[PDB]
Design an enzyme around this catalytic site. Structure first.
Site, PDB file in Angstrom:
ATOM      1  N   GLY A  22      -1.878  20.707-111.673  1.00 56.12           N
ATOM      2  CA  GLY A  22      -2.578  19.450-111.370  1.00 56.12           C
ATOM      3  C   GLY A  22      -1.724  18.260-111.903  1.00 56.12           C
ATOM      4  O   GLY A  22      -2.289  17.288-112.347  1.00 56.12           O
ATOM      5  N   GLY A  24       2.087  16.158-110.819  1.00 59.29           N
ATOM      6  CA  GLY A  24       3.054  16.331-111.895  1.00 59.29           C
ATOM      7  C   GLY A  24       4.456  16.963-111.387  1.00 59.29           C
ATOM      8  O   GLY A  24       5.552  17.067-112.373  1.00 59.29           O
ATOM      9  N   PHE A  25       4.345  17.464-110.343  1.00 60.03           N
ATOM     10  CA  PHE A  25       5.405  18.502-109.515  1.00 60.03           C
ATOM     11  C   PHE A  25       5.550  19.597-110.372  1.00 60.03           C
ATOM     12  O   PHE A  25       6.363  20.482-110.294  1.00 60.03           O
ATOM     13  CB  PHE A  25       6.796  17.775-109.479  1.00 60.03           C
ATOM     14  CG  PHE A  25       6.690  16.763-108.037  1.00 60.03           C
ATOM     15  CD1 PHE A  25       5.668  16.920-107.212  1.00 60.03           C
ATOM     16  CD2 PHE A  25       7.692  15.757-108.150  1.00 60.03           C
ATOM     17  CE1 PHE A  25       5.779  15.981-106.148  1.00 60.03           C
ATOM     18  CE2 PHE A  25       7.624  14.962-107.036  1.00 60.03           C
ATOM     19  CZ  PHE A  25       6.477  15.097-106.112  1.00 60.03           C
ATOM     20  N   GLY A  26       4.601  19.816-111.620  1.00 59.83           N
ATOM     21  CA  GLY A  26       4.490  20.851-112.575  1.00 59.83           C
ATOM     22  C   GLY A  26       3.227  21.138-112.896  1.00 59.83           C
ATOM     23  O   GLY A  26       2.158  20.177-112.754  1.00 59.83           O
ATOM     24  N   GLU A  27       2.743  22.260-113.077  1.00 64.29           N
ATOM     25  CA  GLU A  27       1.434  22.894-113.536  1.00 64.29           C
ATOM     26  C   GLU A  27       0.896  22.357-114.759  1.00 64.29           C
ATOM     27  O   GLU A  27       1.600  22.149-115.753  1.00 64.29           O
ATOM     28  CB  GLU A  27       1.232  24.645-113.430  1.00 64.29           C
ATOM     29  CG  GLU A  27       2.133  24.584-111.901  1.00 64.29           C
ATOM     30  CD  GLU A  27       2.251  26.322-111.691  1.00 64.29           C
ATOM     31  OE1 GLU A  27       2.192  27.113-112.719  1.00 64.29           O
ATOM     32  OE2 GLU A  27       2.587  26.456-110.721  1.00 64.29           O
ATOM     33  N   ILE A  28      -0.284  22.238-115.049  1.00 64.10           N
ATOM     34  CA  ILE A  28      -1.236  21.857-116.250  1.00 64.10           C
ATOM     35  C   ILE A  28      -2.121  22.903-116.525  1.00 64.10           C
ATOM     36  O   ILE A  28      -2.830  23.508-115.775  1.00 64.10           O
ATOM     37  CB  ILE A  28      -1.727  20.490-116.168  1.00 64.10           C
ATOM     38  CG1 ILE A  28      -2.188  19.729-117.265  1.00 64.10           C
ATOM     39  CG2 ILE A  28      -2.840  20.538-115.017  1.00 64.10           C
ATOM     40  CD1 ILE A  28      -1.622  18.489-117.667  1.00 64.10           C
ATOM     41  N   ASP A 134       1.796   6.447-109.389  1.00 69.52           N
ATOM     42  CA  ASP A 134       0.650   7.742-108.902  1.00 69.52           C
ATOM     43  C   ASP A 134      -0.799   7.261-109.156  1.00 69.52           C
ATOM     44  O   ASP A 134      -1.506   8.178-109.692  1.00 69.52           O
ATOM     45  CB  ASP A 134       1.143   9.081-109.292  1.00 69.52           C
ATOM     46  CG  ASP A 134       0.346  10.111-108.183  1.00 69.52           C
ATOM     47  OD1 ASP A 134       0.091   9.808-107.276  1.00 69.52           O
ATOM     48  OD2 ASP A 134       0.777  11.406-108.973  1.00 69.52           O
TER      49      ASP A 134
END
Ligand SMILES: Clc1ccc(Oc2ccc(Nc3ncnc4[nH]ccc34)cc2)cc1
Length: 293
Positions: A22, A24-28, A134
């Site tokens: 979620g 971010g081009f990366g997971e949270i 964003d």
């Protein structure tokens, strides 16, 4: 495959409870901080992945500490497998929170107060030389604590960019900027693949506040980037104003007139909100819509 499995313990301290999205081009991830015994937010990105945004993302979050509407920085680190940032975990995001409302709309009382709070976040990030780029409901969250559930928070800075230079002046814009953000709230400029500015963040805020008050934007259906682009540009925005407080005419007019190089009159936008609440007799400490019985 997720970057981290459940029950992975980063640096022997943060235990992964579950993914929550979620970036971010990366997971949270929601994680337990085994030292402080609190749940925390943990955002990681793979270390073999072209766009490694997370370095500066820390830097923005760092420069912002002490300002309202930011999560408290807890930690960060890098290893040959991934990079990570740990920071304060927050309540429900505004996107989810909106869909919980019966007709997909908040009241103006909620819309205006959130407006005022999101606006402060934008001004704050701008004030340290960064564009967000964003701005969308799902990037704002309410607090989860007694002391914080009224406060609204800016969550992700993955797509951020510094717009200032060495002397802090506004760097020259680039030939073309690739636009890799959320299509629905993007300004006309972002669609045209132009370099974004402070003004473009307010465009999003504008479109957000219309969705909050009305429940929909015209182009809500169209998933196709370029079609939305066409529809936005040819669209008579003065019609979006039709259900907003009338003082919004100043907000639209001010941002319509800004460009990359000119600084926004945030006060002017702030006054739109504050007057709009005054005239609608709306107090600061009123209940938000989701606390409504
Ligand atoms: Cl349309 C849509 C897309 C995605 C979506 O999931 C989301 C999942 C997580 C977040 N972020 C956070 N949530 C709570 N506390 C937080 N602290 C720092 C970041 C953060 C944001 C969104 C929900 C809706």
């Amino acid at each position: 495959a997720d970057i981290l499995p459940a029950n992975y313990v980063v640096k022997d301290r943060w235990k992964v409870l579950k993914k929550i999205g979620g970036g971010g081009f990366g997971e949270i991830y929601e994680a337990m901080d085994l030292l402080t015994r609190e749940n925390v937010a943990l955002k990681v990105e793979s270390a073999q992945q072209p766009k490694q945004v997370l370095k500066m993302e820390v830097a923005v979050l760092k420069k912002l500490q002490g300002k309202d509407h930011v999560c408290r920085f807890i930690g960060c680190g890098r290893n040959e497998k991934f990079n990570y940032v740990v920071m304060q975990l927050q309540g429900r995001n505004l996107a989810d929170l909106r869909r919980s409302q019966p007709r997909g709309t908040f009241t103006l009382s909620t819309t205006l107060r959130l407006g005022k709070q999101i606006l402060e976040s934008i001004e704050a990030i701008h004030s340290v030389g960064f564009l967000h780029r964003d701005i969308k409901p799902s990037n704002f969250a309410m607090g989860r604590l007694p002391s914080t559930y009224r406060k609204c928070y800016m969550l992700d800075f993955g797509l951020a960019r510094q717009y200032t230079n060495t002397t802090g002046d506004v760097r020259p814009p680039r030939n073309v900027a690739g636009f890799r953000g959320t299509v629905r709230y993007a300004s006309v400029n972002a669609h045209k693949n132009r370099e974004m500015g402070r003004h473009d963040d307010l465009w999003s805020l504008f479109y957000m506040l219309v969705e909050f008050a009305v429940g929909q934007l015209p182009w809500r259906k169209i998933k196709d980037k370029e079609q939305v682009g066409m529809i936005k540009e040819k669209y008579e925005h003065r019609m979006l104003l039709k259900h907003m407080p009338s003082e919004f005419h100043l907000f639209l007019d001010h941002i319509a007139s800004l460009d990359y190089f000119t600084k926004p009159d945030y006060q002017l936008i702030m006054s739109v909100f504050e007057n709009s609440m005054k005239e609608r007799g709306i107090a600061e400490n009123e209940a938000f819509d989701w606390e409504k019985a």
